[PDB]
Amino acid sequence: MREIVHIQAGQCGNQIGAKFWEIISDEHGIDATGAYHGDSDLQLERINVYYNEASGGKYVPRAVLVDLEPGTMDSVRSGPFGQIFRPDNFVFGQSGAGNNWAKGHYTEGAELVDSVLDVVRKEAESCDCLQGFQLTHSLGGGTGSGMGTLLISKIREEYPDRIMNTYSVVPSPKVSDTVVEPYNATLSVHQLVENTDETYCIDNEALYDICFRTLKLTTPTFGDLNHLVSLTMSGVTTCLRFPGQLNADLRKLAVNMVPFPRLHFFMPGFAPLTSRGSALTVPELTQQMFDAKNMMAACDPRHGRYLTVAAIFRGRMSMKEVDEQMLNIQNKNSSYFVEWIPNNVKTAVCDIPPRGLKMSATFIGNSTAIQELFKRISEQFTAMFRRKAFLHWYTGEGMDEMEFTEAESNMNDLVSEYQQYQEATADE
Amino acid sequence: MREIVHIQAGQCGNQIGAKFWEIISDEHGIDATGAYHGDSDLQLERINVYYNEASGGKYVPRAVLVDLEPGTMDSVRSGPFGQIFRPDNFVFGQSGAGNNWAKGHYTEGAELVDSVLDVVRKEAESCDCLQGFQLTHSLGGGTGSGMGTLLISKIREEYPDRIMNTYSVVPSPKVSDTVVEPYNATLSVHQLVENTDETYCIDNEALYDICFRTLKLTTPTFGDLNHLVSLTMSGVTTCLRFPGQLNADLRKLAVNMVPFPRLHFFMPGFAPLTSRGSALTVPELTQQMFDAKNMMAACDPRHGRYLTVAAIFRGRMSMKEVDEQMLNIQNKNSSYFVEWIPNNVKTAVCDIPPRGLKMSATFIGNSTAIQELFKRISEQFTAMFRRKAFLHWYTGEGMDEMEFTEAESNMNDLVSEYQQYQEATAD
Amino acid sequence: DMEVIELNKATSGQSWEVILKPPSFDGDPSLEEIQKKLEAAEERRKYQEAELLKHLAEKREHEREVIQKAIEENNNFIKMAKEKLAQKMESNKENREAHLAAMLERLQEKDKHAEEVRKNKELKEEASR
Amino acid sequence: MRECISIHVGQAGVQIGNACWELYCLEHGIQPDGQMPGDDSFNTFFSETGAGKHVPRAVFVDLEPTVVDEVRTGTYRQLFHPEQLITGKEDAANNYARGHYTIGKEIVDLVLDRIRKLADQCTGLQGFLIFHSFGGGTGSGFTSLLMERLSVDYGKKSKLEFAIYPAPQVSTAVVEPYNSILTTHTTLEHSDCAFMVDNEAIYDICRRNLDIERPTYTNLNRLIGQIVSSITASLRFDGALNVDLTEFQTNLVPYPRIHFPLVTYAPVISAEKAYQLSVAEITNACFEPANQMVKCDPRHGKYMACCMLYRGDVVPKDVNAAIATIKTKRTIQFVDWCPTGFKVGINYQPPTVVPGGDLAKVQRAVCMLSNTTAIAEAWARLDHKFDLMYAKRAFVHWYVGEGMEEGEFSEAREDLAALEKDYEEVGMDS
Amino acid sequence: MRECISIHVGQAGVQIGNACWELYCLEHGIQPDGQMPSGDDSFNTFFSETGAGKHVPRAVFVDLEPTVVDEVRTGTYRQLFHPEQLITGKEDAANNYARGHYTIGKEIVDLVLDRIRKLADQCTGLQGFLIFHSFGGGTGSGFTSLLMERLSVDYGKKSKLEFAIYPAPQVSTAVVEPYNSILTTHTTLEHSDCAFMVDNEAIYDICRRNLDIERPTYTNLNRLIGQIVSSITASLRFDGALNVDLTEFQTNLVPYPRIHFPLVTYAPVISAEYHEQLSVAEITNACFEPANQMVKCDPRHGKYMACCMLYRGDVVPKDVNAAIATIKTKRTIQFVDWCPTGFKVGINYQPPTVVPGGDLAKVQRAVCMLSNTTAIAEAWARLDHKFDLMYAKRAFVHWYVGEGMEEGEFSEAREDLAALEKDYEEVGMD
Ligand SMILES: Nc1nc2c(ncn2[C@@H]2O[C@H](COP(=O)(O)OP(=O)(O)OP(=O)(O)O)[C@@H](O)[C@H]2O)c(=O)[nH]1
Ligand SMILES: Nc1nc2c(ncn2[C@@H]2O[C@H](COP(=O)(O)OP(=O)(O)OP(=O)(O)O)[C@@H](O)[C@H]2O)c(=O)[nH]1
Ligand SMILES: Nc1nc2c(ncn2[C@@H]2O[C@H](COP(=O)(O)OP(=O)(O)O)[C@@H](O)[C@H]2O)c(=O)[nH]1
Ligand SMILES: Nc1nc2c(ncn2[C@@H]2O[C@H](COP(=O)(O)OP(=O)(O)O)[C@@H](O)[C@H]2O)c(=O)[nH]1
Ligand SMILES: [Mg+2]
Ligand SMILES: [Mg+2]
């Protein structure tokens, strides 16, 4: 369990993926040319989880950059850390997915999918001990959602024993590109329920609300939203890339987080909440675990119960104080944890804080309140599906209406399964 | 849709045809020898619609001149512009038609018709893109009416896909040559209803009344009547002869003007009314559209409704002012236009005024009031036919009485069809 | 009340028993079995891996069927558009030729009537006086 | 790469094509001879020869040679190869039946052969952009015939229109309502998206915003070229946000028959005056009826989709703020089955104006494409004019004489009656 | 000769082995390179000797992952061990018993057995095995149970003793540790002769209370565990008088095969940071205090079946007997009715040794009490309750089933630990 292969697909997938590589490169002391110029041994200890060592001291991200359109590839190449990526790892088509899940999953995506698998296969065969794959993508568009889910099932077929992990951006009318976002998102959730081991739900509804309500940004942009995503992704991957005891690899994390196979959708939490254009004690950080304002998925943790939680504290702080505050937070909020999974909160402390901060807290929650996110997508989906609006763009790609009804049923079953465990008592 | 082949038949047809050729030659800057000595490029832009280019820079009218008697053709050759015509295009007999439709249509006319078709085929076959044919003739005599309608059906048989257009002079007791004019005119209307696409009704009753009442000519002659006809023909062919958007060819005009195949008889209007030895404002010109005094057919436009109208303004004037005045004239007179043909009035403005004028207006109207012209012919016809007067003039030429009853029925049906559309509501 | 009993004495040690009270009341696996159990677990693990791959193979087949279905629908659309247009162009051709034939037959009938009129004028003329 | 083939049909289609291709040349730095002294997205609209010459991916077709002869002998005579300028001898005489059958069938194979030669030069053809009037015999009848033949040769490949809706102020024929209904009926199942431009709306914008007393086709077409250029700027350039032929269709068309977006454009400022509008100001102008390309009342309808195409000095932050204030407008109503109806595209290249034209150079402009049920008002006006004439069978003999049957008129009108009912049903609440 | 082979399994087993072998080297005068500048020759039970005069542990370090053992291969004692006794796989058991037992373990078990056989082949009087592992880890639980089974087949009449780490949430690495603990106890029960459980919470609290360590690390815990292990193995590695051979552990502490879990108590644990030396009475009194136990449980709620006192250092029999006489006087010390009330005492003259620079102070005398009490069933009850809470919902069970395990194995393992709880209850009746 050493190497992770990262894949980013479509516009959103490539924007949040480029930002992930730039934050973790800064934390690991790696400059835009792949050269290490840091001053801590902890920075290089597990550098090989995300980076390959190329000719003469340079480190190159084990990342494959995918799109059905070239513009996104060009903008990443032109971006701050664009030159760090392996040039032959950029795989792109010319046609685009036309914001259509069916085109990404069955038509244009199927024509480009073997070129992508040849590049991820080269990265995988080069691994001494491949852990699995991490995919960044949106669910509301065509390439990230349709082609990203096609890639997941193809990768599941060729690497059935590896962990499949996603950072999935959920659409919101508050930051919307296309009218068919609820269809593309429902068709992707159906794929994620069946084929991923861990999915981080990155909700644009929540990111917009943090920027507007807490950061007081009257008009948030994707840059403001992606600054919260990059801090969150740095926080959730902390135990994979620095020395530590807990959840040090994708499978140990899944075993600690996933009590039921379908219940693998995580609600990430982060404190402090910051803007790009610029405090915090241990008790203050631990409190944010139940604060809806600190969640990256638009769900209130107090509306459900945590099945499991991974709490990651970063910076120079007392491990003793963190241990005392984490016990107090659980004991004082016992009604928000299922009593039938004892010791379901695991804590880790890392000396290296995320880029731009001195102290932080990141919560990976498996909460039954995530059903609110799925219900919101489902109500938007049925409002369109009831009138069969825009259906001809999917049936014109060869799809049957039965796929829609099946994806909708699977997603409503997922909601109903979270509700079942939310109401379950220890005394059956 | 480039070339038009012109044919002029009989005394009347050749007199108004010679006058048409001299007015449009003057407007296009073409002298009596066919030489262009104009000044404007608009004059030559569409010169090929009516003229062929002969050896050297000369232009020769695509006109065939036809008569069963030689006299009018000799006077055409001797007249102003007589030498412009192609000498081999003069086709004439020696016998005459004795102001009898049957002689022109079946006897003498049938003996000369192949010599005429020889010449029109040569003209028509030489065209890059033939629009069709225009005929000038009277309806009250023998050659223009009888032989002219015979030529129409022969030319239709050989060119069924081309437009057939006529300038038909309707007879009147006010300027009459023969007692049988109502018979010759009814037999020709029967032919025109079935075989022309567009017919301009040039009424001698209206021409005489304009000269007598408005021009104060105590005793008008054909020269006085023909001056009104030449200005009217210059006005109605403006869009065929000069660059423009609207009704630029015979078929686009027919499609805009003719809602029902049989109702293709136009009432032309013209302002100002002048004599041979005589500028109005835009509002004054637009008003003349409903003035019975300005109609070249003896019908009152206020007695019926316009199915369609083409309004042509010529001279240096504001297109904006013409547009405003034309809207006002139809909004203030909405009851004189059928409401079930939306936007049925199309206007065009041309910088070149007709010869002798600085500003003019010409109206091509498809009005249900034209039924007054047909009723007048029909009442004259029945007063003679009821007693079978002069019938041996036609039966002596081989005709049957049945052709008279048929022509009469067809013409009365035409009146009854104009009345039907006049009374029709949108509902 | 304590009975001491010497047990052993050695180079780096000494031991004894101390008795406070006497008691109240006086007084095979096999390699084959292991291998059988391990092989049975391996066969269950291989069976669920094969079921997973069998379902993924069914998804690949469905993917091929949707591509095929879109292709077949485009082909049916082409076939239909082609025969609807061939039918429309031919019906129009028959109609336009029928209207043209009817109007030429009317003109031909006028010619027959004209020679009949000519024949009557001829017998009136000459066969008189 | 991502090519679009333009087909300009009849006088209106050809004259609007003259204005569009003149403007694209100015925007890409292409001289009238095809030479250009990097973006490179213009390759979607221009092919290149071995001599570095840039040639429009376009065919200009007319049944009469006069209008296309001006292209063949004008400023841009070297820009197009002679084989892509196609004309017959005789026009359709304002008759759909002559465009579709009698005259059009004589030239349709030649046009298809030329389009096949342009398609053979495409490595990723997106589809076809067809420019034509609804009113002319060629624009109506030949376009319908061509659309049907394109569906046979290319199946479902995208076909989008720029169609001129008839206006009496500049109308050339009484039968234009007939030509419009027949062409809409025949074309409905073959077209993916049609952008209608009402000549009365452009005429009034020219009089009001540009101070032109009596606007000519030159005034109308230069403004239309500006709108067409805005719709195709996302394809011919690579800006901050792009939208291709496919993205237009997906976001603007909820049902195959409901494919007529309303086009709105701002700002339209006269070359005189000497007085810059903000992103919020030009965005607000998109929802004002005076800036629409089709006369209709969006307050009497509901929005199903809105696509904003910005160009020039425009930043995403300023666009999102403007759309957020539009979302809070009670008077701008959306259908209840539409949770989100906004597709934004931004290009860096400011709107270029023809030297000596009527339009002022502006720093930023926007073209909104909206699917509003209010556009059914334009169909209702056209259908009423059709009914007034058809009740009497007025002018029908012209079509029947060319081989058409009266049953085609009833079917076309019944199809447009179903289209009117489709807009009514689609605007209903769930 | 009475050779003992040590087997260190998984991270906990390996890291505790590092602490134990570091301490044995200090106690026998063996340098980190295996040399000893030379007491008695009893150290040969734990160390073999090579042709170069080096002393090598009779030990195998095994892990399914290489990271922890790699520190042994490259650290201070890298020359103490031969590379063949440090065995690692590539991928760990991911905190899953089924993964370590059925999937991964199965591929390295023959290699480990081969190495054990090579160490056993060097013994003239092999006593048995001392196995160090955690209950909670996938390797410590699954691989250990698999290894115990094969060891019973290959060495039937050989003793097997365990030093097993009982899970504590303060340092817990996985939510499923109660599952791994019950599963490994069930499969290991019939193969183990005696298991000394060490509760991480008890050692964690002793480090905080007795050593003033705010947040104890594995280095702090293992150094304390190493003292206790050294105290128990002292009479095998030196010429002692009590627990002289491995069979004597079961004879002195285990009257029934299933009840083989003695409670370990140790004193004194003093911080390296002046202090008067604790007397025999003081360290003996500390033996009967719950705060000094290796497992959290209440000996008052149970009965003693056997008690072994292992004194070390400056200790005289007279003072031991006087100390035990006072304890009987003030305390009950209830023994089961079939066993006599009394103690087996051993004094090892070798002084307590501490790691230089560690957390523990050098003391003149220390004692380790090993008592088989029925109160240790409280630790099993706590573990069984956590198992039941999760198992009632089948939480995390899919991870084990996915590796080829059946749900029935969970029921069987839990039923076996329910029988173990009832055995402690029946045995403690009168
Ligand atoms: N905006 C605009 N409309 C035009 C232009 N030319 C013609 N139109 C309109 O188009 C309609 C007439 O159709 P045209 O395109 O001229 O006719 P056509 O397609 O050439 O057809 P035929 O001449 O009948 O063969 C009327 O509504 C005109 O106002 C132009 O350049 N610009
Ligand atoms: N006392 C002590 N406990 C430890 C140590 N390392 C791990 N543990 C405990 O052991 C349990 C986790 O098992 P590990 O031994 O780390 O796991 P493993 O045997 O390597 O198994 P996998 O990693 O799952 O293959 C938890 O209860 C830890 O607190 C150590 O050095 N000392
Ligand atoms: N957080 C975030 N969301 C984005 C970004 N870009 C696009 N999105 C969202 O992604 C969805 C559109 O999908 P997109 O990735 O652009 O389409 P694709 O290229 O077809 O995969 C919508 O929900 C957008 O709000 C980005 O940079 N950040
Ligand atoms: N306006 C006008 N009417 C004429 C002219 N010549 C004859 N007519 C009329 O034409 C009719 C007689 O026909 P005419 O052409 O002379 O006989 P044809 O030679 O047999 O055609 C009568 O109605 C005359 O009034 C003329 O030059 N101008
Ligand atoms: Mg035209
Ligand atoms: Mg481990």
PDB file of C-alpha atoms in Angstrom, chain E residues 126 132 218 225 292 367 407:
ATOM      1  CA  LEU E 126      13.428 -26.961  22.669  1.00  0.00           C
ATOM      2  CA  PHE E 132       4.110 -11.512  20.817  1.00  0.00           C
ATOM      3  CA  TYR E 218       4.429   3.203  21.842  1.00  0.00           C
ATOM      4  CA  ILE E 225       6.069  -3.949  28.749  1.00  0.00           C
ATOM      5  CA  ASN E 292      -0.417  -1.644  39.177  1.00  0.00           C
ATOM      6  CA  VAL E 367       8.361  -7.837  41.915  1.00  0.00           C
ATOM      7  CA  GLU E 407     -20.938 -15.141   9.148  1.00  0.00           C
TER       8      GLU E 407
END
